[PDB]
Design an enzyme around this catalytic site. Structure first.
Site, short mmCIF file in Angstrom:
data_model
loop_
_atom_site.label_atom_id
_atom_site.label_comp_id
_atom_site.label_asym_id
_atom_site.label_seq_id
_atom_site.Cartn_x
_atom_site.Cartn_y
_atom_site.Cartn_z
N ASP A 35 0.84 -1.19 0.00
CA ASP A 35 0.00 0.00 0.00
C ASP A 35 0.88 1.25 0.00
OD1 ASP A 35 -1.90 1.91 0.32
OD2 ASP A 35 -2.40 1.39 2.39
N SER A 199 -0.72 15.51 -12.05
CA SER A 199 -0.97 15.16 -13.44
C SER A 199 -1.23 16.42 -14.25
CB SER A 199 -2.18 14.22 -13.50
OG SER A 199 -2.58 13.96 -14.83
#
Length: 330
Positions: A35, A199
């Site tokens: 994770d 992004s």
């Protein structure tokens, strides 16, 4: 040193991925959920409340000649999905894919929430976010990667998750045969303890690319892709009959639909998520309403590039002094 381990989807939907991890001496192999959005290595154990164990493999520290109770240390964690767990702490030898760390903090669960009990395939978590998020008190502990870093050939790990198939976690090296083209690296902020990046935009299907900054985290422990409501609406508007369902808890779509791809930007590069990766199947057994793999982050507080996005890429978690992330197509 290096390590390399195969990671395997837990079910036919790729709801999560499990990776075998050797703990203790002799080794006890547990299948952990790696994770990158958390920083605790915790396991079901011989200390876990018996009614809260239902099929998981447990770590028994009393059977490990290298286990040592970390005196006074406790841990307690709550995850973004509302699940939680807590317990005490041992140090022990932990190996992943041939890479060994001695003295790793292994957080032994005394209590786990129902969602963990109900998932017999996941024996615990191995956190790969920054150690500043580790919950051990009163002395915070380091992640497996943080402990291994100095010994690795290069201070990196890579995630290569498969679509409906196994993939690979590598430590200490880049497998240049595992991706196409080049790896585009992008800046990371560690201020929230995550692999947080920005992004450069998105496209839906064959549509034009929208240049827009989307800050979010690269999180292998989250199944879906959680993005701003504007972006998610633009995606599902291209699927006839798709709608946001308050009762189901997100966007649903007709199972008869063919889903468009979704592209996200990494610098000037583009990662294309095929439409099939966005199908999470019937909302309940036998339903013709299917659950979408792109959902709004509006109620989260952060955008999350979970498995739906990451499995479309070869992803480099570069833990150099100034960390960065790399993405390549594959």
């Amino acid at each position: 040193s290096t390590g390399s381990a195969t990671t395997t989807p837990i079910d036919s939907l790729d709801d999560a991925y499990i990776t075998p991890v050797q703990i203790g001496t002799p080794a006890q192999t547990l299948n952990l959920d790696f994770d990158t959005g958390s920083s605790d290595l915790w396991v079901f154990s011989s200390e876990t409340t018996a009614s809260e164990v239902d099929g998981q493999t447990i770590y028994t520290p009393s059977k490990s000649t290298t286990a040592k109770l970390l005196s006074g240390a406790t841990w307690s964690i709550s995850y973004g999905d509302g699940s939680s767990s807590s317990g005490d702490v041992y140090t022990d030898t932990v190996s992943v894919g041939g890479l060994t760390v001695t003295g790793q903090a292994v957080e032994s669960a005394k209590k786990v929430s129902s969602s963990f009990t109900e998932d017999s395939t996941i024996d615990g978590l191995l956190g790969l976010a920054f150690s500043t998020l580790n919950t051990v008190s009163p002395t915070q502990q380091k992640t497996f990667f943080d402990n291994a870093k100095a010994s690795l050939d290069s201070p990196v790990f890579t995630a290569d998750l498969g679509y409906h198939a196994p993939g690979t976690y590598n430590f200490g090296f880049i497998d240049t045969t595992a991706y196409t083209g080049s790896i585009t690296y992008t800046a990371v902020s560690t201020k929230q303890g995550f692999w947080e990046w920005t992004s450069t935009g998105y496209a839906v299907g064959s549509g034009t690319f929208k240049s827009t900054s989307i800050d979010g985290i690269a999180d292998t422990g989250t199944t879906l892709l959680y993005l701003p409501a504007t972006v998610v609406s633009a995606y599902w508007a291209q699927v006839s009959g798709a709608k946001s369902s308050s009762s189901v808890g997100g966007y649903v779509f007709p199972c008869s639909a063919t889903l468009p791809s979704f592209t996200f930007g990494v610098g000037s590069a583009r990662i294309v998520i095929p439409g099939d990766y966005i199908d999470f199947g019937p909302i309940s057994t036998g339903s013709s309403s299917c659950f979408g793999g792109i959902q709004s982050s509006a109620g989260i507080g952060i955008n999350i590039f979970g498995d739906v996005a990451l499995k479309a890429a070869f992803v480099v978690f570069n833990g150099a002094t100034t960390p960065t992330l790399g993405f390549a197509s594959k």
